[PDB]
Amino acid sequence: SKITFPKDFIWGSATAAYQIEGAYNEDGKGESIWDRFSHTPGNIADGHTGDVACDHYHRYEEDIKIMKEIGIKSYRFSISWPRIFPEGTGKLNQKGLDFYKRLTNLLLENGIMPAITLYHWDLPQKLQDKGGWKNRDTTDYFTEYSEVIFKNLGDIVPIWFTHNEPGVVSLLGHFLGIHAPGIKDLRTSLEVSHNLLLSHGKAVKLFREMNIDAQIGIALNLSYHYPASEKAEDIEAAELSFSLAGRWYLDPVLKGRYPENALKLYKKKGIELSFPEDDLKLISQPIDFIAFNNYSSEFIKYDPSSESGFSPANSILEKFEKTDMGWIIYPEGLYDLLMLLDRDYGKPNIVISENGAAFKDEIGSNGKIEDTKRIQYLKDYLTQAHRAIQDGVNLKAYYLWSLLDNFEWAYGYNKRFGIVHVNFDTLERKIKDSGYWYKEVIKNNGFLE
Amino acid sequence: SKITFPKDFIWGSATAAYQIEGAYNEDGKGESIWDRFSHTPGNIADGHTGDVACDHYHRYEEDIKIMKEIGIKSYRFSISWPRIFPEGTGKLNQKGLDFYKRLTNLLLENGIMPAITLYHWDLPQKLQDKGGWKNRDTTDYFTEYSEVIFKNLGDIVPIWFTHNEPGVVSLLGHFLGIHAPGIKDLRTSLEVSHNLLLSHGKAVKLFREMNIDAQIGIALNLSYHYPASEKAEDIEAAELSFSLAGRWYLDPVLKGRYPENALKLYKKKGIELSFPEDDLKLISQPIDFIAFNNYSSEFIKYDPSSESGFSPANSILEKFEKTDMGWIIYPEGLYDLLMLLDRDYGKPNIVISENGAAFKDEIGSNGKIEDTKRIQYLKDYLTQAHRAIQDGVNLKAYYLWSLLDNFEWAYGYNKRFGIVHVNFDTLERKIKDSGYWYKEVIKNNGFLE
Amino acid sequence: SKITFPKDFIWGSATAAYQIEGAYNEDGKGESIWDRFSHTPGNIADGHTGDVACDHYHRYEEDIKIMKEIGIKSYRFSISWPRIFPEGTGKLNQKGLDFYKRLTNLLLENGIMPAITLYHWDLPQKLQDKGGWKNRDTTDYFTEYSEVIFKNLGDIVPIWFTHNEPGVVSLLGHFLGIHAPGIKDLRTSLEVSHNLLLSHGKAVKLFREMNIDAQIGIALNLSYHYPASEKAEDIEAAELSFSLAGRWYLDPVLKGRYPENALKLYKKKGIELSFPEDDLKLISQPIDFIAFNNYSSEFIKYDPSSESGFSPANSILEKFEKTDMGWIIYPEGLYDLLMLLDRDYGKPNIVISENGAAFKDEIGSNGKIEDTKRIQYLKDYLTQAHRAIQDGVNLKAYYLWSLLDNFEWAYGYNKRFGIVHVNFDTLERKIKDSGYWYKEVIKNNGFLE
């Protein structure tokens, strides 16, 4: 059975700014919460940092030439706020604008259609010294930086993302404090979640005021949450998860409300707080698509142990092949999700801002990366992507995470999601066999599963 | 159920220069490694040689008249390098050119399509004195002789083969040393395999630089390698075999890379070689088809005893009828191979440079060979050839090995692949019944399945 | 469908002086470069010469009686410079003048229209001792001889040709050295090409200073150069071939410029030569018509191996019937050329100085030469001649090469383009069937093709 995707279907690959760019203190770039977090012992694996990374800042001409060689139809990347405003607000750094202006114009002049993320986690460290995303002011400053990007790059860039995975930023960065800025307080973690969504709402409102001829959305971290058993306690436990996890950012943006079952679990721990009703009509602001990042699926059971009244199902999960991250492989999890976004939220336009997988890569005696397990992973998940489009989903785009091997945050460089291998000593690219596979999949517009 | 091949399908028969020509020291031909290897006790069966053979050099008119009487659409032959350059390089022997010029023009005039091989194992003995294929300089000499052939002939010959079975040359000739030039060292055997493939690359690059309106490829020794059992050690033992054997030459030509699983086996015996990266892009040089030479199939099991890590599954192979070479008959092993070349390597144009079988032939009291087994072998393998075309395979040509009975190398004249019987005392031709069969098969363009 | 040429259409046949006249040292005739070149071993086939040839010098009465028997309306012939000036310049040989004066008057009196060529290769050997056409002084001496011919024969001869095929003279005579005077140097070969065209100019300029009541032109060797494939490299290769060949003479004479794409090729080998600007205005001197000599057509492919950048497409040429010369038969390849001259040079008056073919002629048991193939060749090329006139071409004349069998330069007498057979032992004329055919074609003014 040979699969073929819609003829208008856009194939793309994705990266982030901090994860590839490097040049962490060059051309008047201000310090980011990640520059700061990375420089401190106990935060990044093996004391790795971004500082250099793939050095995409300097070697972008080489990277485009590879992007075109594979012939992606869209490159999704992130703009460094701290290159644009080193102090978050005030003095414009024209050097930083000119980089991204140039980069975009090299994409448009090659085959490639730009896709800009506006915040991929690199908040200027200055605004973090005045509270960061806890300080509501930051939500205005985000809009100021958004404004400058739209004036320059507004209508020549077709697809826009406001945020990347605000679910992680709040959870990992502001409660568990294993991501930047390293804060560990539950109340703060919820105040940020809001402040992030609000900032999305302000950017979309400003996007419309300026009337940019392009499409804007938001890139959310999203998995499916299956119950351990088909039983009343386990079906409910799973609904409550998803609601703490993804729905906490899906329902405000698409339904203008926060999930009730989750809000009830906050208040049962002695926390409420009055969201101004007007904010969530600013969040809900109509958007041209929902984007999301998927990799794996969660299997939740009921658990009166754990302060959330639920836990992972350990050994249902210990029946799947696992990626190098320890995340299960389950391709049909992507279908069900796409159907869950379709059914709930009113058959929206869907984009995949990120899908991919991290396996232990080697350069063999033949000087090549034969990553059959990444290719296997890919085609498996892309068969369930297609299967959803056939059963009626409006999935317009797929972006493969990631184009280059990059800085995987608290895991350092120890994990590779790249098609295109990168040696972090020499900065030499070696397109992976998953790369060459993807090239053909774009060209044929599909593959025989 | 009656089978018919595509209307553009080219039926042919094959021979080699040293195996049929004779005249081993006439009209200024230089000595070859095979001349040299034949003249030494212990190397050939019964102290046979290729001094005279079928004496095609003098009796080529007779053979053409026979070729046309059967009505082959293409005659695949080889050019003796030592007739063109007795010293390998330098002084052109015009007598040798004129022979092959004359031959080709008698083919074109008799409505038979020429198909030349440029190297069919007869390396000038002088270049073997300066190392042979181990000395990289040979690869440049091979391009000089290739240049002279293309400048003459060239346009007027549609099908070109750079090499014949460089898998055998390097394995049998340079490691097991049972073929010429009778060398026995593993390291050399791999340095020759590379130097051969390089020389193919350099001939295709020069073939394009001269812009010859004709199609070039390489004739590789290929079988299918089936596992003994559907078990993880046996499947993997059979995938190592194909790499060391056929895939060692397929992958560098069509994928620009050496097989890993093989390269790992060679480093596990303390042998690594840094193939210059620019050689592999020269070897990978696009070609118009892939040609191969099949007879049988292999059935490999896992074997820690054999320092290879595998061995033949004799238990299984002793269930088939076997040719006069102890090689199994298995017709469906040709199909699965054609599908394997189709599946991998991207549905290329496929040619069969050689297929056939060696059975014991007698001339009966009726003065006729009646080799029903050869005919039964032929039609059994051709039914699978046809099956593959119907299931989508781009198999453009079939070349029957061999037109004449000839010098089967280390076996001497003791093995007959003919379709035309040759008495090596008198040099009389008697067309076999396999011959007469083939005549009809070409006329009808098929036979009953 | 019966084809009929314009009522004013002048049917003719052509010969050259050295090829038919003989009497190579009679009545004070100076030695020519062809006398000289012919007397040296290795130059002419079988050691032939033009010492005797057809012996037209004595037997012209017989030849005119034949010309009128067939009833040609014009006879194109050449004047031997050495018969007029044995030493190129100085002392007039009145005997030579009186021959041609007598000849022309016997043609006018037998109702045949003269057509004189002034140089058909027989440069006095004395001028070849002072450098020949490489010495620019020759271009002045040519004008002296041109002056004496015009004084005597000016008015009474309607059609004048300054030169025959300067293309061949320079290329074959002065670069390849297989024609007289046998020189082999590229630089010299171009210096002569210019000097030849200059002399043509000087002769027209003098022809107009005296206002001779007759039409002058130049006879150029011209084929059509088709590209091997409708591809950018092969179209461009063909344009460069025609440029080196014919266009090198067409453009100077009709456009007052040398072809650029050719001149570039010469400078890329490190050869530029400063043509004085005034010479090219003198060359361009308006002319009444352009005459050319066609037999075959070329099929050129792209070839970086040939330092020219192209080569013959043998793969294509080996699909045509070939003359006894080896040249292809391709009738339409006249049509296309007549259109090319018509398009690219401002619909000029066009003559055909020469067309015809060489096939192996026998005198049968009936004492007749039934050369059906030459008659086929003729009527095939004349149908396309007609076709072009219908589609608007100003083709005024057709001259059949050749009236007699004659001395075909380096080929000797081994090639017969006659419509009158000549036994070169006895000098007996036997009008060929092609001769009898032409006679009816002149009468009917056409034929049912």
A364 touches chain B (CB under 8 A): yes
A366 touches chain B (CB under 8 A): yes
Helix (H, G, I), strand (E, B) or coil at A43: coil
Amino acid at C283: I
Contact assignment for B257 to A365 by CB distance below 8 Å: no
Helix (H, G, I), strand (E, B) or coil at A318: coil
B277 touches chain A (CB under 8 A): yes
B164 Cβ contact partners less than 8 Å away, ≥ 6 residues apart: B16, B78, B117, B119, B120, B121, B219, B293, B353
- Would you tell me how many other CB atoms lie within 10 Å of the CB of residue B391? 11
Active site residue B144: no
Mutate to test the interface with B, among A361, A362, A366, A433 (most CBs of B within 10 A): A366
Helix (H, G, I), strand (E, B) or coil at C233: helix
Contact assignment for B155 to C302 by CB distance below 8 Å: no
Q: Which of C228, C304, C314 is closest, CB to CB, to B156?
A: C314
B257 touches chain A (CB under 8 A): yes
B316 Cβ contact partners less than 8 Å away, ≥ 6 residues apart: B228, B299
Question: Two tokens at A350?
Answer: 């869907």
Contact assignment for B154 to C318 by CB distance below 8 Å: no
Subunit partners of chain A (3 or more CB pairs within 8 A):
B
Give the residues across from A397 on adjacent strands: A10, A351
Question: Two tokens at B102?
Answer: 């004359």
A399 Cβ contact partners less than 8 Å away, ≥ 6 residues apart: A12, A13, A14, A74, A76, A115, A351, A352, A353, A354, A355
Contact, B427 vs B197, CB < 8 A?
no
Total number of residues shown for chain B? 449
Cα distance from A440 to chain B (closest Cα, Å)?
10
Amino acid at C227: P
Nearest to A93 by CA among A36, A22, A145: A145
DSSP assigned state of C134 = G
Contacts of B260 in chain A (CB under 8 A): 364-366, 368, 370
CA–CA separation, B336 and B345 (whole Å): 14
Cα distance from A420 to chain B (closest Cα, Å)?
17
Contacts of B272 in chain A (CB under 8 A): 365
Mutate to test the interface with A, among B258, B268, B279, B347 (most CBs of A within 10 A): B258
Catalytic residue among B191, B298, B354, B408: B354
Catalytic residue among C21, C298, C354, C408: C354
CA–CA separation, B83 and B96 (whole Å): 5
Contact, A24 vs A51, CB < 8 A?
yes
B264 touches chain A (CB under 8 A): yes
Give the residue on A whose Cα is nearest the Cα of B273.
A365
CA–CA separation, B219 and B15 (whole Å): 13
Contact assignment for B108 to C228 by CB distance below 8 Å: no
Question: Two tokens at A100?
Answer: 């991204």
Give the residue on B whose Cα is nearest the Cα of A363.
B260
Contacts of B257 in chain A (CB under 8 A): 366-368
Pairing of strands B395-401, B420-422: unpaired
Give the residue on B whose Cα is nearest the Cα of A368.
B257
Contact assignment for A365 to B258 by CB distance below 8 Å: yes
CA–CA separation, C404 and B265 (whole Å): 80
C228 touches chain B (CB under 8 A): yes
Give the residues across from C116 on adjacent strands: C77, C160
Amino acid at A404: L
Cα distance from A419 to chain B (closest Cα, Å)?
18
Contact, C40 vs C130, CB < 8 A?
no
Give the residue on B whose Cα is nearest the Cα of A370.
B260
Q: Which of C301, C304, C305 is closest, CB to CB, to B213?
A: C301
Q: Find the largest Cα–Cα distance for chain C.
A: 62
CA–CA separation, A237 and A304 (whole Å): 10
Contact present, A and C (at least 3 Cβ pairs less than 8 Å): no
Catalytic residue among B165, B191, B298, B408: B165
Helix (H, G, I), strand (E, B) or coil at A48: coil
C102 Cβ contact partners less than 8 Å away, ≥ 6 residues apart: none
Question: Measuring CA to CA, how many Å separate C381 from each of A346, B102, C327, C433?
Answer: 77, 33, 14, 17
Helix (H, G, I), strand (E, B) or coil at A446: strand
Contact, B168 vs B223, CB < 8 A?
no
Give the residues across from C448 on adjacent strands: C2
Nearest to A179 by CA among A145, A128, A113: A128
Give the residues across from C397 on adjacent strands: C10, C351
How far is C-alpha B24 from the geometric centre of its chain's CA atoms? 21
Contact, A400 vs A14, CB < 8 A?
yes
Nearest to B251 by CA among B210, B222, B293: B222
- Would you tell me how many other CB atoms lie within 10 Å of the CB of residue A194? 22
Pairing of strands C298-302, C310-312: antiparallel
Contact, B348 vs B289, CB < 8 A?
yes
C283 touches chain B (CB under 8 A): no
A12 Cβ contact partners less than 8 Å away, ≥ 6 residues apart: A72, A73, A74, A75, A76, A113, A115, A397, A398, A399, A400
Contacts of B258 in chain A (CB under 8 A): 365-366
A370 touches chain B (CB under 8 A): yes
Give the residue on A whose Cα is nearest the Cα of B263.
A365
A319 Cβ contact partners less than 8 Å away, ≥ 6 residues apart: none
Subunit partners of chain B (3 or more CB pairs within 8 A):
A, C
Contact assignment for A365 to B263 by CB distance below 8 Å: yes
Cα distance from C247 to chain B (closest Cα, Å)?
25
Q: Helix A56-70 to helix A94-109 angle, to the nearest 10 degrees?
A: 10
How far is C-alpha B88 from the geometric centre of its chain's CA atoms? 22
CA–CA separation, A379 and A185 (whole Å): 41
Active site residues of A: 165, 354
Identify each DSSP E strand in B348-441 by its residue range. 350-355, 395-401, 420-422, 429-431
C303 touches chain B (CB under 8 A): yes
Contact assignment for A370 to B260 by CB distance below 8 Å: yes
Helix (H) or strand (E) holding B3: strand B2-4
CA–CA separation, C270 and C192 (whole Å): 18
Cβ pairs B/C, distance under 8 A:
27
Give the residue on C whose Cα is nearest the Cα of B153.
C314
Total number of residues shown for chain C? 449
Counts of helices then strands in chain B (DSSP H, E):
17, 15
* HEC per residue, A80-143: CHHHHCCCCCCCCCHHHHHHHHHHHHHHHHCCCEEEEEEECCCCEHHHHHCCHHHCCHHHHHHH
Cα radius of gyration (chain B) = 21
B108 touches chain C (CB under 8 A): yes
Subunit partners of chain C (3 or more CB pairs within 8 A):
B
Question: Measuring CA to CA, how many Å separate A252 from each of A239, A260, A283, A284, B363?
Answer: 16, 11, 6, 6, 93
Mutate to test the interface with B, among C236, C306, C311 (most CBs of B within 10 A): C311
* Tokens 């609904």 belong to residue: A239
Question: Two tokens at A292?
Answer: 């999301």
Contact assignment for C315 to B156 by CB distance below 8 Å: yes
Contacts of C228 in chain B (CB under 8 A): 213
Question: Two tokens at A331?
Answer: 């391709």
- Would you tell me how many other CB atoms lie within 10 Å of the CB of residue C344? 12
Cα radius of gyration (chain C) = 21
Give the residue on C whose Cα is nearest the Cα of B147.
C305
Give the residue on C whose Cα is nearest the Cα of B151.
C305
How far is C-alpha A304 from the geometric centre of its chain's CA atoms? 32
Q: Which of C305, C314, C315 is closest, CB to CB, to B209?
A: C305
Q: Is the peptide bond before C402 cis (omega within 30 degrees of 0)?
A: yes
Amino acid at A287: I
B378 Cβ contact partners less than 8 Å away, ≥ 6 residues apart: B356, B357, B400, B434, B437, B438
Give the residue on B whose Cα is nearest the Cα of C318.
B156
Pairing of strands B446-448, B2-4: antiparallel
Contact, B253 vs B287, CB < 8 A?
yes
Nearest to C155 by CA among C98, C201, C106, C216: C216
Active site residue C165: yes
Cα radius of gyration (chain A) = 21
Question: Two tokens at A134?
Answer: 């806890």
Question: Measuring CA to CA, how many Å separate A230 from each of A142, A184, A331, C374?
Answer: 44, 35, 21, 97
Cα distance from B308 to chain A (closest Cα, Å)?
18
CA–CA separation, A79 and A164 (whole Å): 12
Helix (H, G, I), strand (E, B) or coil at C76: strand
Contacts of B211 in chain C (CB under 8 A): 301-305, 311
Q: What is the dihedral of CA B261, B266, B268, B272, to 10 degrees?
A: -110
Helix (H, G, I), strand (E, B) or coil at C333: helix
Contacts of B108 in chain C (CB under 8 A): 318
